[PDB]
Nucleic acid binder design. Structure first.
Lengths: 98, 117, 121
DNA sequence: CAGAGGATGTGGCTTC
DNA sequence: GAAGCCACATCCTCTG
């Protein structure tokens, strides 16, 4: 699906979770789907580096992520400073039918 | 505001522009006029008709006749028509019996409103 | 004027009407964003109330219907199992699968009311 | 101030 | 290739 050819967030963001050398800026938080946000504005910076969008900040990237809610890609861990989680039981209805 | 013909010459409605974005605050709200004397209080709903996705999603689609002029706070077109394709939107007036005026080539509903390409 | 002077002519001359004079492909358009189960109940309870929303898929023409002047000859759920049997553009005119929420239907010029209505002028 | 969210332009990418 | 999509961009707003 067009996640393959053109770069996403969730496809991109998880180049940094799985990779040990980028934990400088994020990490898996636990057994269940969760993730921390280390530098909230170095994160956004590299997403600018890729998107060729130098103006990028958290506020910008973040909004994009808050869209995902209504589409059932990921969801928020309420009250936690900058931690959401991925819905995979829905990424596969969002990448395959029934 | 400005008006246009119908397929029932007893009622008229707004000039809904050529091509617009999926679900926007319309550039001119929707007025629907009663030339035949209608009890100010009668309901009016619209249904987007097109060979493709024959009933599109709409918002604030129901309105109340008042002073012989039913106005829609803000109608919004969600269900897209397709490429080159517009809506023949139906227009109901809830009475005994109810009456309808078809309206061919109403508006082209795409995701982008026409940006300079 | 609720109707056009040549009520019979418009029905037998307008591409719009003759394109709907033949038995066409129709379907229930109510609550499109709802599960097939809810749509089935809503559509049946509503028919029993004497109303619904059906549209000619082929042409794109939608309608909100009222089966009246509860009835008998306007909404019959007996003529067949698993299914059930106005003034359009100034012209007095007159089945869906209870599971598929689709079927066939058409328009028929109303001579009776065409006269009654025309007489009101 | 974070966090959900409407509105509206933007840019890459399939489809006629 | 404009004409429809797409999945953010960039925006200014509330409201806990």
């Amino acid at each position: 699906m067009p996640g393959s050819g053109q770069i996403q967030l969730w496809q991109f963001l998880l180049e940094l979770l799985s990779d040990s050398a980028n934990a400088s800026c994020i990490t898996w938080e636990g057994t269940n789907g969760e993730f921390k946000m280390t530098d909230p504005d170095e994160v956004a910076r590299r997403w600018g580096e890729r998107k060729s969008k130098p103006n990028m900040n958290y506020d910008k990237l973040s909004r994009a992520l808050r869209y995902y809610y209504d589409k059932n890609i990921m969801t928020k861990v309420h009250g936690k400073r900058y931690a959401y989680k991925f819905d995979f039981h829905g990424i596969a209805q969002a990448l395959q039918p029934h | 505001a400005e008006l246009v013909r119908t397929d029932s010459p007893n009622f008229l409605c707004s000039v809904l522009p050529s091509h617009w974005r999926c679900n926007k605050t319309l550039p001119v709200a929707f007025k629907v006029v009663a030339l035949g004397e209608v009890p100010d209080g009668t309901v009016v709903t619209v249904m987007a008709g097109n060979d493709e996705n024959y009933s599109a999603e709409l918002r604030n689609a129901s309105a109340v006749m008042k002073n012989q002029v039913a106005r829609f706070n803000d109608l919004r077109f969600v269900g897209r028509s397709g490429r080159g394709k517009s809506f023949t939107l139906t227009i109901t007036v809830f009475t005994n019996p109810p009456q309808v005026a078809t309206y061919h080539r109403a508006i082209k509903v795409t995701v982008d409103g026409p940006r300079e390409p | 004027p609720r109707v056009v002077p040549d009520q019979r002519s418009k029905f037998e001359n307008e591409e719009f009407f003759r394109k709907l004079s033949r038995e066409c492909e129709i379907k229930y358009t109510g609550f499109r964003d709802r599960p097939h189960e809810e749509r089935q109940a809503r559509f049946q309870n509503a028919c029993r109330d004497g109303r619904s929303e059906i549209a000619f898929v082929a042409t794109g023409t939608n309608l909100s219907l009222q089966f009246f002047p509860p009835s008998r000859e306007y909404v019959d759920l007996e003529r067949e199992a698993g299914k059930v049997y106005m003034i359009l553009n100034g012209v007095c005119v007159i089945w869906i699968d209870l599971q598929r929420l689709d079927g066939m239907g058409c328009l028929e010029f109303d001579e009776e009311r065409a006269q009654q209505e025309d007489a009101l002028a």
